[PDB]
UniProtKB/Swiss-Prot annotation:
<protein>
    <recommendedName>
        <fullName>Phospho-furanose lactonase</fullName>
        <ecNumber>3.1.1.104</ecNumber>
        <ecNumber>3.1.1.25</ecNumber>
    </recommendedName>
</protein>
<feature type="binding site">
    <location>
        <position position="272"/>
    </location>
    <ligand>
        <name>Zn(2+) 1</name>
    </ligand>
</feature>
<feature type="binding site" description="via carbamate group">
    <location>
        <position position="153"/>
    </location>
    <ligand>
        <name>Zn(2+) 2</name>
    </ligand>
</feature>
<feature type="binding site">
    <location>
        <begin position="275"/>
        <end position="278"/>
    </location>
    <ligand>
        <name>substrate</name>
    </ligand>
</feature>
<comment type="similarity">
    <text>Belongs to the metallo-dependent hydrolases superfamily. Phosphotriesterase family.</text>
</comment>
<dbReference type="InterPro" id="IPR054957">
    <property type="entry name" value="PhFuoseLconase"/>
</dbReference>
<dbReference type="InterPro" id="IPR001559">
    <property type="entry name" value="Phosphotriesterase"/>
</dbReference>
<feature type="binding site">
    <location>
        <begin position="244"/>
        <end position="245"/>
    </location>
    <ligand>
        <name>substrate</name>
    </ligand>
</feature>
<feature type="binding site">
    <location>
        <position position="214"/>
    </location>
    <ligand>
        <name>Zn(2+) 2</name>
    </ligand>
</feature>
<dbReference type="GO" id="GO:0009056">
    <property type="term" value="P:catabolic process"/>
</dbReference>
<comment type="function">
    <text>Catalyzes the hydrolysis of D-xylono-1,4-lactone-5-phosphate and L-arabino-1,4-lactone-5-phosphate. Also able to hydrolyze carboxy 1,4-lactones.</text>
</comment>
<feature type="binding site">
    <location>
        <position position="186"/>
    </location>
    <ligand>
        <name>Zn(2+) 2</name>
    </ligand>
</feature>
<feature type="binding site">
    <location>
        <position position="24"/>
    </location>
    <ligand>
        <name>Zn(2+) 1</name>
    </ligand>
</feature>
<keyword id="KW-0862">Zinc</keyword>
<keyword id="KW-0479">Metal-binding</keyword>
<dbReference type="Pfam" id="PF02126">
    <property type="entry name" value="PTE"/>
</dbReference>
<feature type="binding site">
    <location>
        <position position="26"/>
    </location>
    <ligand>
        <name>Zn(2+) 1</name>
    </ligand>
</feature>
Length: 353
């Protein structure tokens, strides 16, 4: 037997326990830069989150990966309350270390800008292998939870990879290489996905460990296919019930295209419900009827069957693919001399060395 594990906030589990997995979601977003953009990004209700998680499990789901990097909204303590409330129902929660896109960090004075890459990797490795900081790397005082992170995030901005984002991708790659952890990268409007994949692989990261999210905001089925085929990474889509970007139908038809091209093993799904009105129970706390996690099962997955995606492809998308991409690799040494020439050259051009 393979005997691979994933790292949840409650401990390492066999990847076979992951079950149906929402690969990019949120429950608690406790302040941070996002809240500056809009009050709706503030999400602080443990009871509402647990109720929403229970509706997810009620429909057949088991695992949620809450992708909040330490400095952008993450709350270890509250998320651990949620995890503990569902564990005996088969619920699992994986949390993240790492960084969001550069726009969320002060480019002059943030620790991302200023602290040498190597010291940052040590802090990310520590969240994966010792415990996440309950103060979320907000400052010089650290108080580690017994809960560990099970994945590392990075993010890129619109139509461009910033020099600090390339630095954060190097952090993600190195941490992943050293700990075996998986990586998920947020792209802005689904831009630069091909390049994000190329650079992470150029640093030495294993493409089987890599998800790139938000491609649904660049609804280009040819590009999706190009990314999967040239790099081997996995695309994590959100998009259901985000009509202000694109209708559900477009994502379903693009997925159907990829499945028809034989690429069903390279697709994961998520709701990325990272605003307060994007969950049903939260919506209720604001006096509103809204959709949340149940909608994946009640509405989106049936639309997928309707446009011609098989139940077997869906089983890969919800179960087999997460079981592959969230599994820890064996630990490796990081060798800076094996970094690809294309990456080294780009670091030089971006004044990163």
């Amino acid at each position: 037997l393979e005997n691979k594990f994933a790292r949840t906030v409650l401990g390492d589990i066999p990847v076979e326990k992951l079950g149906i997995t929402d690969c990019h979601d949120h429950f608690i977003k406790n302040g941070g830069p996002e809240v500056e953009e809009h009050i709706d990004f503030l999400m602080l209700n443990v009871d509402a989150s647990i109720k929403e998680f229970k509706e997810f499990i009620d429909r057949g789901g088991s695992t949620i990966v809450t992708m909040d990097p330490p400095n952008v909204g993450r709350d270890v303590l509250k998320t651990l309350e949620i995890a503990n409330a569902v564990k005996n129902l088969g619920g699992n929660v994986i949390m993240s270390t790492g960084f969001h896109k550069a726009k969320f960090y002060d480019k002059y004075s943030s620790w991302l800008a200023v602290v040498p890459t190597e010291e940052i990797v040590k802090m990310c490795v520590a969240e994966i292998e010792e415990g996440m900081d309950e103060y979320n790397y907000n400052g010089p005082v650290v108080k580690r939870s017994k809960a560990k992170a099970g994945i590392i995030k990075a993010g890129t901005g619109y139509g461009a990879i910033d020099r600090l984002e390339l630095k954060a991708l190097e952090v993600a790659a190195r941490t992943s290489i050293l700990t075996g952890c998986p990586i998920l990268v947020h792209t802005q409007l689904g831009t630069m996905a091909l390049e994000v994949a190329k650079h992470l692989i150029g640093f030495g990261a294993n493409p089987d460990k890599i998800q790139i999210s938000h491609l649904n905001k660049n609804p280009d089925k040819y590009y999706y296919e190009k990314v999967i085929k040239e790099t081997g990474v996995t695309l994590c889509f959100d998009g259901p019930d985000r009509v202000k970007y694109y209708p559900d139908s477009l994502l379903a038809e693009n997925i159907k295209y990829l499945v028809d091209k034989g690429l069903q093993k390279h697709i994961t799904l998520s709701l990325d419900a990272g605003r307060i009105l994007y969950q049903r129970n939260y919506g209720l706390t604001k006096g509103k009827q809204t959709f949340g996690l149940a909608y994946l099962f009640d509405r989106f997955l049936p639309l997928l069957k309707q446009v011609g995606v098989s139940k077997e492809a869906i089983f890969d998308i919800l179960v087999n693919n997460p079981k592959r991409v969230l599994a820890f690799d064996e630990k490796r040494n990081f060798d800076p001399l094996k970094v690809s020439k294309e990456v080294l050259e780009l670091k030089k051009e971006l004044n990163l060395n």
